[PDB]
């Protein structure tokens, strides 16, 4: 693995240092339908005219990005996405901007968000949840080795491809950092206690988030929930965790080690790093090489009827894409 990782880092750095820009333009696509929205942008299913291929276009209104104070975060988003390459990360196909917006054109992952399936079915069986988790574990290993923190792990940012595997999207809060950082960001239910307490944090927040993800997948609901974010934070900081009666002893043990407030005891942040997680009893049946190679048996394969089918996604109110005759925030987004 340390062999593979070294080459990966060489590959990443070349791209991080000389990022690609302006690799397409708006009139080369036909906007079809919104696939999903977040606090910052909207992602539409689009079709590329010359090739006939479908893609998922993320649209960011430059004025909104500024108001919400996400200028640096958006630059991080694009700069990182174009440099990474891993089997479980969505691919950035093209990127560009115009007077009003910023655009990130990704490969279309037609299986839908994990969120939707998870809430529909209620929860995933342990082997099913384990299959997704192993993939996230190998992805954070790859990302962390490049000095990258992900910061927004949640079912809503995970998509299922045609083979039934995971594809991570939304690098909105992804940042390349050596040392600590202080930005209060993410999603309430998944924030680690260090973040909420304004003490400065590192990669270990991603491992706490994995603990939260595994718990939600296998339980069907999060470990810390309430009606308002402030109440949620109180529960996270207290640390008390309660497990459903069907959780296996192995699962509970792993989770107590991930949802660990003491960052000097939290799995993933110890001497053995990621190996403490890989060698855990809960992951004994996991063939780590087979998973990376996609040779493992996918528990659930989404049904898809032809290219361009959006049946695995919810419907969203459509909104006209506006583009001023005047350039907006030109300097701020120069490198994009």
């Amino acid at each position: 693995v340390k062999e593979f990782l070294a080459k990966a880092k060489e590959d990443f750095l070349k791209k991080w240092e000389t990022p690609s820009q302006n690799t397409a333009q708006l009139d080369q696509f036909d906007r079809i339908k919104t696939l999903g929205t977040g606090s910052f942008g909207r992602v539409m299913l689009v079709k590329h005219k010359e090739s006939g291929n479908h893609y998922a276009m993320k649209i960011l209104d430059k004025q909104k990005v500024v108001k919400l104070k996400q200028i640096e975060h958006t630059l991080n988003e694009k700069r990182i996405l174009q440099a990474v390459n891993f089997p479980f990360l969505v691919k950035l196909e093209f990127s560009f901007k115009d007077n009003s917006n910023l655009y990130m054109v990704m490969e279309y992952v037609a299986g839908g968000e994990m969120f939707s399936h998870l809430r529909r079915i209620g929860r995933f069986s342990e082997p099913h949840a384990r299959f997704y988790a192993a993939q996230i574990v190998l992805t954070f290993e790859y990302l962390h080795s490049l000095d990258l923190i992900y910061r927004d792990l949640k079912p809503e940012n995970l998509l299922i491809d045609q083979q039934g595997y995971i594809q991570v999207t939304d690098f909105g809060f992804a940042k390349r950092v050596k040392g600590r950082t202080w930005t209060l960001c993410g999603t309430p239910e998944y924030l680690a206690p260090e973040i909420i307490l304004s003490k400065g944090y590192n990669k270990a927040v991603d491992w706490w988030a994995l603990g939260v993800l595994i718990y939600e997948m296998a339980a069907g609901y999060p470990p810390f929930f309430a009606d308002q974010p402030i109440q949620i934070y109180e529960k996270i900081v207290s640390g008390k965790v309660r497990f459903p009666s069907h959780f296996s002893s192995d699962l509970k043990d792993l989770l107590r080690n991930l949802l660990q407030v003491d960052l000097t005891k939290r799995f993933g942040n110890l001497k053995n790093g990621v190996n403490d997680i890989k060698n855990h009893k809960w992951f004994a049946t996991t063939d780590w090489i087979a998973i990376y190679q996609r040779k493992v048996e996918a528990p659930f394969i989404p049904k898809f009827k032809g290219p361009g089918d959006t049946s695995n996604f919810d419907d969203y109110e459509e909104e006209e894409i506006r583009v001023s005759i005047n350039e907006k925030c030109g300097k701020e987004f120069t490198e994009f």
Binding site: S39, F173, T187, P188, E189, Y221, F225, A226, D227, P229
Partner: peptide
């Protein structure tokens, strides 16, 4: 049950990131 309390909660839908 914990389930029933989550299902009756106001955070069962898609959760968007935090914005200041």
């Amino acid at each position: 049950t914990t389930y029933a309390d989550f299902i009756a909660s106001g955070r069962t839908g898609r959760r968007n990131a935090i914005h200041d």
